[PDB]
Ligand binder design. Structure first.
Ligand SMILES: Nc1ncnc2c1ncn2[C@@H]1O[C@H](COP(=O)(O)OP(=O)(O)OP(O)(O)=S)[C@@H](O)[C@H]1O
Ligand SMILES: [Mg+2]
Ligand SMILES: [Zn+2]
Ligand SMILES: [Zn+2]
Lengths: 343, 334, 366, 360, 366, 108
């Protein structure tokens, strides 16, 4: 029942392997390296079989049952990996997992990879049964604040030397794409064996390959950093993400902000936050957004959003991204006369 | 569907044409909601499909009448949108036209009923144009629409237009009073609100729409003095948003007419709210707000899948902006 | 009122009526089967709003007149569940029919028979009788030229034309015409009607080429045919089928005779290298010579030469090889006569042995 | 079998068609000279003779007596075309045949020679409904088709078609029929139908036709059905909801003189009498235009309004031209938005109150 | 280039070469067969890149040497569609091939032979003749155990190892290994190569129980088989097949000899009475007793008792019914001997009479 | 698939694709490989009214030639020449009106 992290998982494996393993999170590089380390430790221990299966209703289970109830002809103590679906286990998958836990054997080394389960999905019969001998490695992608420390530690483990400028450049270029960040670190190490990576060194051999989500864009707009908002909008545009989801995500927070600002005239903020049941970590962010802009704003923003939606699903043009970045700049502490944007 | 008394004359007229064999193949009924145009179309189809009609009414016992009662007549190919949708596709028109393309099984006449030509798709209407121009022998069409202007020019040209005018105001008032036990003022307000078309007012009374209107009126009464129009969203955000916008538009129009001087108002049931709204707002502000409300209602009705709450709150914010002194008020212009 | 039925005799009419019926009739009662009893016979009827198929079978046990409706799916399931060769007992008791399967009793929903879309009275305009062989031959000769889906609604069926002692079937799709006429032995009024695709297909799949003649009666709007114990009625279209005399070539001067087997083999061999989509071929006809040529978009040339009898000049005619092959397959004779005027005119195909049938093919213009 | 006047009186020769002299002359000259194109696009408003002219051209091309400017209408092919039976005249609906297979078979069967006639006419209706891929595929056929097929294209609005289609087609702009032509055609039809008619009724029906003769015939049939088989002025006025009285002028005077109570009372009584609101707006627009005209030139006023001359003249002396233009603009704005208003009464009242807001 | 043949002689080899070649080709020329006439022989190769089937036919007419590639499908259609017994004369004019048959002529587009994927001049590492019977026996003995679909690509096929005057085939799918050896009679260098599933399937398809000595040539990455005048070349699947020597138990002291037919019928009865999937059957063997029970915790235990000739220690093992049934089917005889060491070991099955073929399976842990 | 085969009689197997911009993105990508390295006896002649829809790769793989709308004077001169060749009476004002009506498309 031990919750651990991939950074310190090597020591946990070295002190002794565990019957059950499961990697939960969203970071691809951390999950991949944890899986590789576990598999290598198992192989050193003497496990030669590395069976992998993907959980899906279309996929069968007779082969899985036969392999879990049977050894290997020219090996022993197999290892089985299960790739959970992105949405998460359903009732049938829950039945399958508890069945697997029922006949689980010590010689089999269980590994599970997939998106981190939710609170409702956290509790389950198979999960409780495995809790007696379950070590779960959290594999979430570090936040922007946690990114510089993570990349600095990664570089130090690689015997490289990074300054503040190089760390900032790497964070900017590979925000949320830590796999590409590590690949870039390896490439830079190969290019310059000396190990000293100054700002020209990193900047001349890097590319903008960051990946984001619309929630990150809304957070950037709330903070008010124009450069980050424009960068994330560019990344989402290049990724091909449709603007409808961005518009909806922006609209939700815009309506929340408008309601809070209008009803905060004679009502304490704490009572409103408690009633709305918003995230505790977002209380200060919402306060900063509210006090950063007055009622003069949050009015042309809504009209601009409505105009954007109309021009999107009525004219069916391609200038939606221009309107989105205009609204992004508007939400920041900018003049934005709105004559250009037709707010 | 129900057969309202005021359908007696018009029906008796239309059937007379079919009594002489000179009836128009394509008939377009211009009737407001609640006027029972569906009942009129059903009665006309029953008369047409009756094997041995007597006078105007059908016999009620011939094979055609029995099939109509059972609702399985091989003829009488009706067109209507899918229950889970709100528009009629071209495929339905295609298959109905193909079925009409051959002789009637009973050897009598074939009837086609389009429940609402307004919901008909442009492609569907254009496909229907050919069969409507030169229908096969003994083929009759019965279209229906609230606003024939919304239909295509060609389709309106093909059809013979019959306008089902509503009854006299007093007749509708007394009919509703006999039907629903409520104050005559509320009945008159509903009738004027429903464009003086009984049945639609009756439908409004039957549902919870009356309580919604009362809540909206109370919210507007609270908002007008304080100026906090945003709270109105609470009483406006609903699946029936266009109806609530129409109610608000009628209230604003009544206030404006009271300002200009008038003896009758649509919202007679709330003199106090109309008086307060007229007193607390200038005629230019009332006109601007009414135009904005009507435009947003039209956008909500015409546009499909538009974010309702977003448009409503944008309208509320713009209305609040207009009330601020020194702000230029937009004026309608084609 | 007791209904005693034998499973072995019950099987056949039920399958025939359930054939056209689908999984979702789209109406609550359309898929239901109307069972009626009159005098000493019972009729099982099924309709799909555009056809009515009724099987009439006699009985020996006493009964009383009546009519009722039974769901097709539940009835078929009950029949399947019962052991083969057993007896079926059905009783009309109240609003729900009662079926006795051995010691078990089951209740089945019933619906009024007055709601079934079936004709109560029938009027016939022209009626006659013919052996099934005549109709089978006529349809086999004419149907393959029937159009499947064309904007010209009148061209997607078969024209039945009864003139005096002669009965004729005509079909076309704008590119090929097939006509088959022959005497029937009795005089009839000059009447022409059009039977749609579904009617002809159902008639063919229902016809068995038996020795018992069938009676056909055509009314103002519908056509009904009774063969043995089955009666199928469909509704016509009356799209004013084009006159077939005009489409035929007017005095085709150039006549050439050929062997049906040789010609069909040559066309089949040419078709392999012809355009798989356009399927066009060229025929250079000269004195006792027929050169068939075919090309492909890849420029694959296929040429062959056939010896025939022909006294005309030299000409080049384009054709659709598929239509010619279909005509030859539907011909089934030892000799084939082709009549034509010029390269830009329709070409007629007949048999020297008997002219009871003829075909016309529209050439290719590039 | 009884047929409506639109079907009964469909032109069967180039002389029975009313108006559109230029296109008819061009078609006749082309047929006579033998200079015939392979693509005839007809553009114009509804009820002007698209299908009629297309069918007449098809008959002329397919007549058994050679290519004739005026088809006889009695041949086998001529009669079949008149009855919609001719196989070589394929009438295609663009909206229905939008799928890929439809156009693919449309351009695949062109190579086959005509079954009966000398030309395999393709009459495609409302061509603007075809998909872009359909136009792209049909460009080749429309450019260099075989010398046995003619494409006849009909569309309400030609601009929506791809520019290439317009380039490859001869465009004939069917002018909207004027009031005089519609009145003359209706008079001729009623005289040939042995139906009595009044000049006022014919004028009103032609005015309400809005330039389309099919709409005029439909209105005539509606009046016949309602008018107990008689085209009477009173019956047509009742059917069409035409004021033809001083109510419109009184309402215009009230609107110009503010006095909102009078305007509201007039609208209330008009609604009680059940009139057509679009007719009321059109009447107001006509009155305002006449007032402007008399302000510019007093001699431009007729005698029909003599009973209301002086009062009308008073407006021409009291209302400055700019105010007249403002009122006309407001009435036109109301006209545009009347269909889209929640109710016709609400639209009219909003328009009149907006006009009332204007004042010197 | 020019030659003349009869369609009777070409119908079979064309079908053979064009059989495996199906679907769209990876390269356009791979969709075409390469035919070459030289020294009185016409060889047609239906290359599939991975596999090459070559059919050789004899030429007696005055041909002319030459090679060219032509699409297989249309050429085969042309050859098949001609009249039976007709002679086909093929010539090359320009870049096209002309086919003449009596009065019929065809033209086909031909790609240059240079662009055809050339069969490299790799010399066979081990070439040796062998009768068909031994090869067929080896394939039958070592084809039921190879994995049909496994992540380990090298286990999809089976491994042929030639050592001295011996050829051995080993197949496995992760649980059982079947190994069959046959003395070739000629000393050869040691060499191991994995043949893929499709290659062996095609090879066994080629086998027809003839007297032609089947010549096998094992190369660095290609295996070729000559049967009479037909050649089949396949690309050996790479990887490294696990050594079978370690898999074979050293001293399986415990022995069990029993009638093969008795075990076959017992397993068939268990399978038919235990059609439910999963839940491998548990067999308890004791002195003159064998009780097979269904592991299904839900389905009733269809226990079956047989009187085997075993008289050793008693134990219960949870085997898979399908696995043992297939293994016993592969060994079709009257008696069978299974040797095991303990509860957890690989039981080796063999024929009580012959021991050339071994069937080392392992129990399914319970 | 049939591009590799040699031309029937012509020295090149010229391809002329009309309105190439209508091809899907996948079709363009599949065509890229043959466009870069076509057989020596194969020539591609793409044509489209809207060149901005084409992928940048397609544009870079081929020589572009953007035909310009013909001048009004050029259209008038061409009309005069063809009418003179056909022996048809014409007036300068009529030719000017026709040239004005035809914006830049000589076909119009
Ligand atoms: N120019 C015209 N001359 C004579 N009759 C006409 C004319 N235009 C319309 N009509 C009459 O109106 C009927 C139908 O109108 P059409 O001739 O189809 O005009 P249309 O433009 O084709 O109508 P659309 O565009 O399909 S709605 C005809 O049968 C005539 O009776
Ligand atoms: Mg028309
Ligand atoms: Zn009746
Ligand atoms: Zn004629």
């Amino acid at each position: 029942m031990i919750r651990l992290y991939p950074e310190q998982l090597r020591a946990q494996l070295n002190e002794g392997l565990r019957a059950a393993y499961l990697l939960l999170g969203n970071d691809p590089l951390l999950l991949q390296e944890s899986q590789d380390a576990v598999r290598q430790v198992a192989a050193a221990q003497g496990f030669e079989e590395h069976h992998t299966f993907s959980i899906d209703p279309n996929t069968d289970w007779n082969a899985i049952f036969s392999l879990c109830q049977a050894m290997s002809l020219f090996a022993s103590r197999q290892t089985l990996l299960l790739l959970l679906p992105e949405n998460g286990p359903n009732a049938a998958i829950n039945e399958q997992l508890l069945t697997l836990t029922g006949l689980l054997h010590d010689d089999l080394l269980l590994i599970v990879r997939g998106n981190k389960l939710s609170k409702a999905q956290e509790n389950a019969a198979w999960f409780t049964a495995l809790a007696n001998r379950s070590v779960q490695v959290t594999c979430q992608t570090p936040e922007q604040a946690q990114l510089p420390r993570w990349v600095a530690a990664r570089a130090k483990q690689l015997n490289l030397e990074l300054d503040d400028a190089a760390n900032q450049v790497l964070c900017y270029c590979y925000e949320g794409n830590l796999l590409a960040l590590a690949q870039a670190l390896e490439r830079l190490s190969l290019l310059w064996p000396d190990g000293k990576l100054t700002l020209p060194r990193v900047e001349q051999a890097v590319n903008d390959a960051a990946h984001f989500t619309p929630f990150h864009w809304v957070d950037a707009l709330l903070m008010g950093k124009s450069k980050r908002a424009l960068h994330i909008l560019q990344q989402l545009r290049l990724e091909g993400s449709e603007p409808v989801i961005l518009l909806r995500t922006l609209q939700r927070e815009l309506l929340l902000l408008v309601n809070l600002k209008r009803q905060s005239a004679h009502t304490p903020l704490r009572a409103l936050f408690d009633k709305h049941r918003v995230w505790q970590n977002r209380r200060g962010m919402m306060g900063e957004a509210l006090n950063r802009l007055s009622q003069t704003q949050l009015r042309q923003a809504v009209q601009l959003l409505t105009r954007t939606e109309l021009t999107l699903k009525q004219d069916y043009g391609q200038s939606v991204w221009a309107e989105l970045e205009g609204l992004s700049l508007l939400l920041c502490h900018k003049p934005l006369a709105d004559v250009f944007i037709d707010g | 569907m129900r057969w309202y008394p005021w359908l007696r004359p018009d029906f008796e007229k239309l059937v007379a044409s079919y009594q002489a064999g000179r009836g128009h193949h394509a008939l377009l009924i211009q009737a407001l909601p609640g006027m029972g145009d569906d009942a009129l179309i059903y009665a006309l189809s029953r008369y047409l499909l009756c094997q041995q009609p007597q006078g105007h009414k059908s016999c009620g016992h011939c094979r055609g009448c029995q099939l109509m009662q059972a609702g399985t007549h091989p003829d009488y190919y009706t067109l209507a949108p899918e229950k889970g949708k709100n528009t009629l596709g071209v495929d339905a028109v295609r298959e109905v036209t193909e079925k009409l393309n051959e002789h009637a099984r009973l050897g009598g006449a074939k009837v086609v009923w389009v429940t609402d030509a307004a919901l008909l798709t442009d492609a569907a209407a254009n496909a229907l144009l050919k069969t409507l121009e030169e229908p096969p022998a003994e083929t009759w069409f019965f279209l229906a629409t609230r606003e024939p202007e919304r239909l295509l020019a060609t389709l309106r040209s093909r059809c013979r237009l019959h306008y089902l005018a509503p009854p006299p105001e007093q007749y509708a008032v007394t009919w509703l009073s006999r039907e629903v036990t409520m104050s005559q003022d509320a009945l008159l307000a509903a009738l004027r609100l429903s464009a003086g078309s009984p049945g639609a007012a009756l439908a409004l009374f039957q549902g919870d729409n009356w309580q919604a209107r009362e809540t909206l009126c109370q919210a507007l009464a609270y908002s007008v003095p304080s100026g906090d129009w945003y709270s109105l969203l609470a009483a406006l955000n609903h699946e029936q948003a266009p109806a609530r916008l129409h109610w608000l538009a009628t209230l604003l129009m009544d206030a404006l007419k009271r300002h200009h001087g008038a003896a009758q108002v649509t919202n007679v049931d709330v003199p106090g709210l109309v008086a307060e709204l007229a007193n607390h707002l200038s005629p230019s502000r009332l006109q601007a707000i009414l135009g904005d409300v009507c435009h947003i209602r039209e956008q909500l009705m015409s546009v499909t899948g538009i974010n309702r709450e977003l448009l409503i709150t944008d309208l509320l914010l713009r209305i609040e902006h207009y009330l601020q002194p020194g702000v230029v008020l937009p004026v309608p212009h084609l | 009122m007791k209904f005693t039925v034998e499973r072995e005799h019950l099987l056949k009419p039920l399958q025939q009526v359930s054939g056209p019926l689908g999984g979702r009739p789209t109406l609550p009662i359309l898929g239901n089967l109307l069972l009626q009893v009159a005098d000493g016979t019972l009729s099982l009827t099924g309709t799909d709003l555009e056809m009515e198929m009724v099987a009439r079978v006699a009985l020996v046990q006493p009964h009383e007149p009546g009519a009722t409706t039974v769901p097709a799916r539940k009835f078929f399931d009950i029949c399947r569940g019962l052991p083969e060769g057993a007896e079926i007992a059905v009783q009309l008791e109240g609003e729900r029919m009662l079926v006795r399967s051995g010691r078990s009793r089951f209740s089945l929903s019933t619906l009024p028979a007055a709601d079934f879309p079936n004709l109560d009275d029938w009027q016939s305009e022209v009626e006659f009788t013919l052996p099934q062989a005549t109709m089978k031959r006529l349809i086999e000769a004419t149907q393959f030229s029937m159009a499947h889906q064309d904007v010209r609604y009148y061209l997607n069926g078969m024209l039945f034309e009864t003139e005096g002692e002669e009965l004729r079937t005509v079909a076309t799709d704008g590119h090929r015409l097939a006509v088959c006429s022959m005497p029937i032995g009795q005089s009839l009024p000059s009447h022409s009607v059009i039977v749609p695709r579904k009617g002809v297909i159902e008639l063919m799949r229902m016809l068995d080429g038996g020795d018992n003649p069938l009676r056909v009666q055509i009314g103002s709007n519908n056509i009904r045919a009774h063969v043995g114990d089955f009666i199928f009625t469909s509704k016509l279209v009356d799209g004013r089928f084009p006159d077939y005399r005009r489409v035929l070539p007017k005095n085709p001067d150039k006549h050439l005779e050929a062997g049906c087997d040789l010609l069909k083999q040559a066309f089949a061999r040419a078709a392999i290298l012809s355009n798989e989509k356009f399927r066009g071929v060229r025929l250079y006809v000269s004195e006792n010579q027929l050169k068939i040529t075919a090309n492909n978009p890849e420029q694959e040339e296929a040429e062959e030469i056939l010896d025939v009898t022909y006294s005309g000049a030299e000409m080049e005619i384009g054709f659709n090889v598929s239509y010619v092959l279909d005509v030859l397959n539907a011909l089934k004779c030892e000799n084939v006569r082709m009549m034509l005027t010029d390269s830009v005119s329709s070409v007629q195909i007949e048999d020297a042995a008997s002219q009871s049938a003829a075909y016309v093919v529209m050439p290719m213009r590039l | 079998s009884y047929q409506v006047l639109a079907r009964k009186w469909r032109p069967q020769t180039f002389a029975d068609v009313v108006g559109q002299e230029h296109v008819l002359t061009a078609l006749a000259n082309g047929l006579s000279l033998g200079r015939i194109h392979h693509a005839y696009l007809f553009s114009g408003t509804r009820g002007v003779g698209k299908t009629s002219i297309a069918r007449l051209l098809a008959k002329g091309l397919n007549c058994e007596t050679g290519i004739t400017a005026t088809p006889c209408g009695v041949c086998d092919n001529c009669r079949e075309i008149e009855q919609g039976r001719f196989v070589d005249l394929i009438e295609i609906d663009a909206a229905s045949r939008t799928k890929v297979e439809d156009t693919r078979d449309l351009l695949d069967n062109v190579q086959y020679a005509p079954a009966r006639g000398r030309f395999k006419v393709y009459l495609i209706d409302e061509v603007h409904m075809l998909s872009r891929h359909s136009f792209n595929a049909l460009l080749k056929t429309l450019e260099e088709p075989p010398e046995h097929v003619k494409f006849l294209l009909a569309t309400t609005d030609p601009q929506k078609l791809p520019v290439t289609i317009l380039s490859r087609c001869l465009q004939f702009h069917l002018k909207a029929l004027d009031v005089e032509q519609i009145r003359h055609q209706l008079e001729h039809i009623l005289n040939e139908e042995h139906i009595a008619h009044e000049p006022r009724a014919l004028q009103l029906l032609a005015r309400a036709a809005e330039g389309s003769l099919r709409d005029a015939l439909s209105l005539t049939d509606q009046a016949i059905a309602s008018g107990d088989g008689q085209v009477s002025t009173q019956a047509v006025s009742a059917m069409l909801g035409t004021l033809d009285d001083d109510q419109a002028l009184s309402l215009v005077e009230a609107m110009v003189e503010a006095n909102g109570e009078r305007v509201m009372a007039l609208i209330n009584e008009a609604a009680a009498r059940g009139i057509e609101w679009e007719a009321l707006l059109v009447e107001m627009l006509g009155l305002l235009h006449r007032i402007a005209m008399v302000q510019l030139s007093p001699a431009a006023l007729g005698n029909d309004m003599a009973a209301i001359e002086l009062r009308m003249r008073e407006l021409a002396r009291t209302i400055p031209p700019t105010d007249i233009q403002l009122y006309y603009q407001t009435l036109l704005i109301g006209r545009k938005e009347l269909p889209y208003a929640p109710d016709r009464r609400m639209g009219v009242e909003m328009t009149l109150l907006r006009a009332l807001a204007f004042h010197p």
